[PDB]
């Protein structure tokens, strides 16, 4: 399908300057099929772009390919495991000749793991793996074109992504034992996302789901495909307005630390995730714990905590649709209250209710929410 | 029993296209991966595709990419195969094929149960 | 697109004597510690049944005189004895990535 485009100095200068006044740091994916006779890469159009970056003192980190896994398929050419870690090499070895010898090299960007991809990424370690600094791979549950309503409540789909998970880290811990793990691109469903779900209420299921699996079970960094673009998985719309799954991840950056605990259910449709609190928030303190929790059950759930943590105050922070269209909206209210960008330049405050000490916490059908345990006063928090 | 049924043999045109069918029963038709073989009259056998009626997610034989579109109906236990720019080369019986417990790609290892085939001509 | 081929096109064998069909692929047909070989048995006029999966485990309703070896990139189908139902194409197929490729076929003749 896709025909060569040539991009321009004022682009890369547009791109840097849009992450840089952001607050962001670029990783900048470099392309892989172009080729030597020996089908090595042409190292040439890269320097020329590094040469570029380090004449404006841009601090870039670097991947090369995308979904290698296809290249067969979106361009007739099939290019190995051992020789794509070979190219990589070549990238270190003009990375550590540069102006920014200490930038980041991620890679390669591989699929989920089927067995063909799972070969391409275990034989890309062993020639490859000494230069990347992380493992990135991309993940999707459905196929945009048929995925249905059902299958992003069910939890037979969400399930799924554990055992992509664990597959990954069988051929990283077979090769590379330790390397940290990245999803370097993911989402609901491939091919520009479903509609009319993706951009949904509906999404957050997945994508908080993702986010608590991920963190559970080893991945450093989880990349959300998209940002903005013309896919419906995008966060923020065509008119640049945000869509539920934007709040989402605000909520989270908010409320959620670092720090990766567990929570569990003694009973699958209730969904449980546990870290320490962001204690960048004012509001909070060292020792505070954030609860979240996904209920897939069509009737509201109650929510007990255990012993010592009973009766202590808690903040929450429940996600709801605006109505009419129920998970179908792409609006979404925080304990009521609708969010909306107060103008171009102003997020809202996030708002929480504090409930009574003492209370169950109530999780209403097909709804997620955020709770903040305050004076935990937990020991691997501080 | 565990069965599928496919179209009645087409006799159509060259350059036209041509819709195959294949129901199944017996089984959960969401909670298994349906592949589609190829057969030249008395020539061999070939793979086409397979596609998981739940995910949907396809995987195509590089040769019959574009020639070859796999879709799943979740509503009616049935699976389709259209096939288009027919010529002599596509005049052949096509199977559909089962055997994938669960959803993911690596959970397909091998093809249970057949349908009887749909033979496909074309001259005009 | 591992290339499968298989050793015999054709073999007569005589009824009760032991049939050995070889099956080569080039790469490997093995992830992990499982080989992912298939075998099916085309009828005259009819649909190809599973006899064998992962090389070497005997699928249902398949008699216990059908038997898999093999592991690699070498494989071989092993009846023992032939009866006159034999008589069939018999393909060998490798599940171990996509695209999954096919043998030629090995067609099986009964001396009687």
């Known amino acids: 399908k896709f025909k060569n485009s040539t991009y321009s100095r004022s682009s890369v200068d547009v791109l840097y300057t849009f992450a840089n006044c952001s607050g962001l740091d670029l990783i900048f994916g470099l392309n892989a099929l172009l080729r030597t006779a020996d089908l090595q890469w042409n190292s040439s159009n890269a320097q020329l772009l590094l040469d570029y970056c380090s004449s404006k003192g841009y601090n870039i980190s670097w991947e090369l390919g995308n979904e290698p896994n296809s290249f067969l398929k979106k361009a007739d050419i099939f290019i190995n495991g051992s020789q794509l870690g070979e190219d990589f090499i070549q990238l270190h070895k003009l990375l550590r000749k540069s102006t920014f010898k200490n930038a980041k090299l991620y890679g390669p960007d591989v699929g989920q793991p089927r067995r063909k991809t799972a070969k391409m990424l275990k034989s890309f370690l062993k020639a490859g793996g000494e230069v990347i600094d992380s493992v990135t791979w991309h993940h999707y549950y459905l196929n945009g074109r048929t995925a249905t309503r059902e299958d992003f409540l069910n939890p037979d789909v969400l399930d799924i992504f554990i055992s992509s998970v664990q597959k990954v880290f069988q051929v990283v811990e077979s090769t590379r034992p330790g390397k940290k793990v990245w999803l370097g691109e993911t989402s609901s469903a491939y091919g520009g996302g479903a509609p009319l779900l993706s951009d949904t209420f509906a999404a957050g299921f997945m994508w908080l789901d993702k986010l608590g699996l991920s963190a559970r079970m080893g991945i450093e960094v989880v990349m959300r495909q998209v940002f903005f673009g013309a896919g419906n998985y995008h966060l923020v719309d065509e008119n640049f307005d945000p869509l539920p799954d934007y709040w989402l991840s605000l909520l989270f950056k908010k409320l959620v630390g670092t720090k990766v605990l567990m929570a569990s259910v003694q009973g699958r449709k209730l969904r449980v995730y546990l870290h320490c609190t962001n204690t960048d928030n004012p509001r909070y303190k060292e020792g505070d714990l954030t609860l979240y929790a996904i209920n897939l059950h069509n009737v509201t759930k109650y929510l007990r905590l255990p012993y010592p943590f009973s009766n202590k105050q808690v903040d929450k922070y429940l996600l709801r649709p605006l109505g009419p269209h129920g998970l179908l909206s792409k609006s979404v209210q925080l304990n009521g209250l609708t969010l909306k960008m107060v103008d171009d330049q102003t997020l809202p405050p996030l708002m929480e209710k504090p409930l009574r000490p003492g209370s169950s916490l109530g999780l209403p059908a097909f709804s997620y929410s955020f709770f903040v345990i305050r004076n935990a006063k937990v020991a691997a928090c501080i | 029993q565990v069965q599928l049924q496919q179209s009645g043999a087409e006799l159509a045109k060259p350059g036209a296209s041509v819709r195959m069918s294949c129901k199944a029963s017996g089984y959960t038709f969401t909670n298994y991966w349906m592949h589609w073989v190829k057969q030249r009259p008395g020539q061999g056998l070939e793979w086409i595709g397979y596609i998981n009626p739940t995910t949907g997610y396809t995987e195509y034989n590089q040769k019959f990419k574009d020639k070859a579109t796999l879709t799943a109906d979740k509503s009616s236990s049935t699976a389709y195969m259209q096939l288009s720019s027919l010529t002599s080369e596509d005049s052949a019986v096509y199977y559909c094929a089962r055997g994938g417990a669960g959803y993911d790609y690596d959970e397909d290892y091998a093809m249970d149960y057949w349908g009887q085939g749909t033979s496909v001509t074309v001259s005009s | 697109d591992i290339v499968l081929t298989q050793s015999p096109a054709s073999l007569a064998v005589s009824l009760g004597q032991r049939a050995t069909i070889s099956c080569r692929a080039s790469?490997?047909?093995?992830?992990?510690?499982?080989?992912?070989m298939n075998w099916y048995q085309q009828k005259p006029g009819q649909p190809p049944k599973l006899l064998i999966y992962?090389?070497?485990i005997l699928e249902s309703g398949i008699p216990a005189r059908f038997s898999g070896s093999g592991s690699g990139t070498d494989f071989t189908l092993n009846i023992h004895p032939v009866e006159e139902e034999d008589a069939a194409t018999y393909y060998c197929?490798?599940?171990?990535?996509?695209?999954?490729?096919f043998g030629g076929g090995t067609k099986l003749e009964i001396k009687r």
């Open positions: 992962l090389a070497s």
């Open positions: 790469e490997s047909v093995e992830y992990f510690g499982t080989s992912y």
């Open positions: 197929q490798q599940s171990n990535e996509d695209p999954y490729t």
